[PDB]
Amino acid sequence: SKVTTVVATPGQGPDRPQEVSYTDTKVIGNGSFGVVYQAKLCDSGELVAIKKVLQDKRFKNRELQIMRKLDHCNIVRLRYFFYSSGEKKDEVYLNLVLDYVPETVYRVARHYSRAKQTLPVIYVKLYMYQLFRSLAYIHSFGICHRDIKPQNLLLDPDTAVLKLCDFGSAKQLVRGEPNVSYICSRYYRAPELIFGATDYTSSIDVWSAGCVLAELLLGQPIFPGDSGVDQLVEIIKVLGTPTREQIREMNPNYTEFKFPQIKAHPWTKVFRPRTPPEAIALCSRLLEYTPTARLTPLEACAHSFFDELRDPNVKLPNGRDTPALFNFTTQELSSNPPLATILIPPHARI
């Protein structure tokens, strides 16, 4: 166990490096983006996750920045950050020291998925509500995850506390500037995004969150497809054919069009015979073609589907009480304060 000692900068305080050392270093994730390690901090003896990434060098790392601003109880925390290396031309490697969380909605989904069962609705609420709330947070700052997917929804089992991770493909959408295109993922990219948009809002994250809720309600991605265009061929078969009235609102210079003129089969039949009325409705007001027609994270939190969480007797399947689900800050209420008369129930404080 080599006690690796480095120079780190508190992603929380100002900018004043102090020696931090760790150990137990063990890889736990490698791929598309990052080489997420796992380690014990020689001091607190705590658990953490080091997210090793290539440091642009000639430019400023966006992930590190967006990460330093944040500080929401439902978004993996940035403890420290330090640099590493390799060789050749000496590409620098940025190290993000973060809060170690175990499972994920992904690993959790792939589990009930091979048990022909499904995530009990009460858990779905706790996970989704907590996700939508984190969204409500970053978005209030104009930041867009642009990659809300089951894989980046970390979740601590014995707490049912979901923290959003991987802010790599996340950028701050500013109005009056076209964003190219490249981003998000396969099963969780939005329609406008497949129609190659460029003036798309944060509403895209709502669409990715929308899917995840649909997937958790079916035990399989709702809009499969490995090919973008082929994917839409599937979205339509579910939601229905997108009118010029819609394709227009989606923004596209698609002055033309020619796709599967299929007549949709109601959300009451897409979801298994048991899906409760509201979890279906919430999904309907989530998965819509018109970007400016979808629920806003804040409103999503206040969808009837999460009432059970606003009930004085919310019994947590684990035993101990449910996560701090109401400490809404003025910032998260930013988009529509009035909804505080719904989000913070009559028995809440702090």
Ligand X SMILES: CS(=O)(=O)Nc1ccc(CCNC(=O)c2ccc(O)c3nc(-c4ccc(Cl)cc4Cl)[nH]c23)cc1
307 is catalytic: no
Query: Could you give the 3-state DSSP secondary structure of residue 227?
Result: coil
Distance CA 316, CA 160 (A): 8
Q: Annotated catalytic residue: which of 90, 99, 147, 199? A: 147
225 annotated to bind ligand: no
Residue 296 is classified by DSSP as: P
Distance CA 18, CA 330 (A): 33
Q: Applying CB under 6 A, does 51 fall inside the site for ligand X?
A: yes
| Shortest reach from residue 64's CB to ligand X, in Å | 13
Q: Applying CB under 6 A, does 28 fall inside the site for ligand X?
A: yes
Contacting residue, 8, 39, 49, 282, with ligand X by CB under 6 A: 49
Query: Taking contact as CB under 6 A, which single stretch among the options 27-35, 244-252, 295-303, 313-321 is the one that binds ligand X?
Result: 27-35
Give the binding-site size for ligand X (rule: CB under 6 A).
22
Nearer to ligand X, 221 or 240 (CB): 221
Contacting residue, 3, 46, 56, 107, with ligand X by CB under 6 A: 107
CA dihedral 126, 219, 163, 54 (to 10 degrees): -170
H-helix or E-strand spanning residue 289: none
Query: Taking contact as CB under 6 A, which single stretch among the options 32-40, 53-61, 269-277, 288-296 is the one that binds ligand X?
Result: 32-40
34 annotated to bind ligand: yes
Contacting residue, 20, 36, 144, 160, with ligand X by CB under 6 A: 36
Nearer to ligand X, 107 or 265 (CB): 107
- In DSSP terms, 143 is beta-bridged to 172
Query: Could you give the 3-state DSSP secondary structure of residue 88?
Result: coil
Contacting residue, 80, 81, 82, 100, with ligand X by CB under 6 A: 100
Query: Taking contact as CB under 6 A, which single stretch among the options 9-17, 28-36, 223-231, 258-266 is the one that binds ligand X?
Result: 28-36
Nearer to ligand X, 196 or 228 (CB): 228
Per-residue contact string for residues 57-96; x = within reach of ligand X by CB under 6 A:
-------------------x--------------------
Q: How far is CA 24 from the centre of its chain?
A: 29
Q: Applying CB under 6 A, does 101 fall inside the site for ligand X?
A: yes
Using CB under 6 A as the binding rule, the residues of this chain from 139 to 158 that contact ligand X are: 151-152, 154
Of 146, 234, 240, 133, nearest to 193 by C-alpha is: 146
Query: Could you give the 3-state DSSP secondary structure of residue 338?
Result: helix
Residue 75 is classified by DSSP as: B
Q: Which residue has the tokens 């780190």?
A: 8
The residue sitting closest to ligand X, measured at its beta carbon, is: 29
Residue ranges in the chain assigned as alpha helix (H)? 62-69, 105-112, 121-140, 191-194, 203-215, 228-239, 244-249, 267-270, 277-284, 297-301, 307-310, 330-333, 340-343
Phi, psi for 248 (deg, rounded to 5): -70, -55
Active-site residues: which are they?
147
Please give the annotated binding residues, written as ranges: 28-36, 51
Binding residues for ATP: 28-36, 51
